[PDB]
Write a protein that binds this ligand. Structure first.
Ligand code: HEM
Ligand SMILES: OC[C@H]1O[C@H](O[C@H]2[C@H](O)[C@@H](O)[C@H](OCCCCCC3CCCCC3)O[C@@H]2CO)[C@H](O)[C@@H](O)[C@@H]1O
Ligand SMILES: CC1(C)[C@@H]2CC[C@@]1(C)[C@H](Br)C2
Length: 464
């Protein structure tokens, strides 16, 4: 009849005074102790429903996809995206952009590389770069971003950028800084009080700026493509979209607009780069802390692939330990602890509550990934979380780091291919070292908000 229960709010402040200063997720986890898996928190001016645990999350997104499939705003980036592009769209725009993006992130031109071949080539460029690093220390972020960006770059722009390209790296810096700022304490506070805080200086302005700087490139690239576009031979995702645009041009309301083109593209890049990159960063920090796991992966690589032949997607089936380690990396690293906000699209009953149209809903994917019934000792990194007693791969319906239902990560397929190929191709050719002994490696995230972001760290890649 009413909203889910939760702490009693104040006017203006919502439940500010009941929050935990360590952040939104920690706040919410404390509410769950008291209220259970379904509860309401007033984030500044508004109510927001939190759903926790895999059962409630799956009930909402899968059993009730007709109601829970809308997209809410992320206050730090809404003034940039404004409902354009597939991540932040709703209604028919979302339908159109989703169908477009899924198709063009899957099917490429006449005789163009598969996703797998694109990742395999990128991985060879990476291991050549690592060989040329001569075991030097580095923070591998730029490379992890490079390789993931370059996959999307091959689909969207028909090209890759060289790791030495300073303009490429500049754009990668902006993706890195932006995700951090968004995930910062200010960005979490901004989610509560954007109506107030937006009038002052702050990191919201820096994020807007960063995003515009990236978007400027995309605009320009769109202009260049429009200038050389061959309708008989589209080169890439941009041409394909330009084609649709030309086809629907007599419709003033076509969703194939220039703003959707720029911001959809930016969306794909942001989500395509920074997610997988961050996962690899955590992944290798975890390998430094648990060298026995990496040695064990290497054994499996040796025994299944050998030292020479490039890993291929077919290899997954035979490498349960390695797939387990990647599952566990993704589980532990908990990229988007609160997922991406949704919003009910119609009045919905949910577990005897009534959640009205337009209410924001956070699916707290972190609660599924740390569910102690599915994962013994969920706070620890342990690949056996994903193996049975025989050492066979043990998948579980709790593993929902890409979410579920209509808005499920559209890049799931690509990200899993990337994680598998990049991870195994690196481990096949290199072992890792660093100046920090494993016992001293601190896994505490540098930021934990919309994104969980690992600390910076130095690493060496030692040729085998
Ligand atoms: C480790 C990698 C990744 C993780 C953990 C991840 C996670 C997620 C999550 C949790 C969502 C929100 C789903 C929801 O709204 O309930 C999402 C959406 C999205 N992901 Fe990913 N993702 C990853 C990689 C990628 C990649 C590589 C791409 C592009 C190739 C991508 C493109 C997107 C897009 C476009 C959406 C918006 C989908 C929609 O609103 O319809 N993701 N992702
Ligand atoms: O379009 C307006 C802007 O154009 C210029 O900057 C260029 C830079 O001079 C030029 O060096 C830069 O190159 C970027 C190349 C690599 C981009 C790759 C990434 C872009 C999108 C996400 C994936 C990867 O692109 C910028 C934007 O087109 C001018 O320098 C700017 O002052 C101006 O604001
Ligand atoms: C996927 C994302 C681009 C990443 C996590 C949620 C996001 C929508 C915001 Br813009 C940062």
């Amino acid at each position: 009849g009413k909203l889910p229960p939760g702490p009693r709010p104040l006017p203006l402040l919502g439940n500010l005074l009941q929050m935990d200063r360590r952040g939104l997720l920690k706040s919410f986890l404390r509410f769950r102790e008291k209220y259970g898996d379904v509860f309401t928190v007033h984030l500044g001016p508004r109510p927001v429903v939190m759903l926790c645990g895999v059962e409630a999350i799956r009930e909402a997104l899968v059993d009730k996809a007709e109601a829970f499939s809308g997209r809410g705003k992320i206050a730090m980036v809404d003034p940039f995206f404004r409902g354009y592009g597939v991540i932040f769209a709703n209604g028919n725009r979302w339908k159109v952009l989703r169908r477009f993006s899924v198709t063009t992130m899957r099917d490429f031109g006449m005789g163009k590389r598969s996703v797998e071949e694109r990742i395999q080539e990128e991985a060879q460029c990476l291991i050549e770069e690592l060989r040329k690093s001569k075991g030097a220390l580095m923070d591998p972020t730029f490379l992890f971003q490079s390789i993931t960006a370059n996959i999307i770059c091959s689909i969207v722009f028909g090209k890759r950028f060289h790791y030495q390209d300073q303009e490429f790296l500049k754009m990668l810096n902006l993706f890195y800084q932006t995700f951090s700022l968004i995930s910062s304490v200010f960005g979490q506070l901004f989610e509560l009080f954007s109506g107030f805080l937006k009038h002052f200086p702050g990191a919201h302005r820096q994020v807007y700026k960063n995003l515009q700087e990236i978007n400027a490139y995309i605009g320009h690239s769109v202009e260049k493509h429009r200038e050389t576009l061959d309708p008989s031979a589209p080169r890439d995702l941009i041409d394909t979209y330009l084609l649709h645009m030309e086809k629907e041009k007599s419709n003033a309301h076509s969703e194939f607009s220039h703003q959707n083109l720029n911001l959809n593209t930016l969306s794909l890049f942001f989500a395509g780069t920074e997610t997988t990159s961050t996962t690899l960063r955590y992944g290798f920090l975890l390998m430094l802390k648990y060298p026995h796991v990496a040695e064990r992966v290497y054994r499996e690589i040796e025994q299944v692939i050998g030292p020479h032949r490039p890993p291929e997607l077919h290899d997954r089936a035979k490498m349960p330990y390695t797939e387990a380690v990647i599952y566990e990396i993704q589980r532990f690293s908990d990229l988007l602890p609160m997922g991406v906000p949704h919003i009910v699209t119609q009045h919905t009953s949910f577990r005897g509550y009534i959640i009205p149209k337009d209410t924001e809903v956070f699916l707290i994917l972190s609660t599924a990934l740390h569910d102690p019934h599915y994962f013994e000792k969920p706070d620890a990194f342990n690949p056996d979380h994903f193996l049975d007693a025989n050492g066979a791969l043990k998948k579980t319906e709790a593993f929902i780091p890409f979410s579920l239902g209509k808005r499920i990560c559209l890049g799931e397929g690509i990200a899993r291919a990337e994680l598998f190929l990049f991870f195994t191709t690196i481990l096949q050719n290199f072992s890792m070292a660093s100046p920090v002994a494993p016992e001293d490696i601190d896994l505490t995230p540098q930021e934990c908000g919309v994104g969980k972001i690992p600390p910076t760290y130095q690493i060496r890649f030692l040729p085998r």
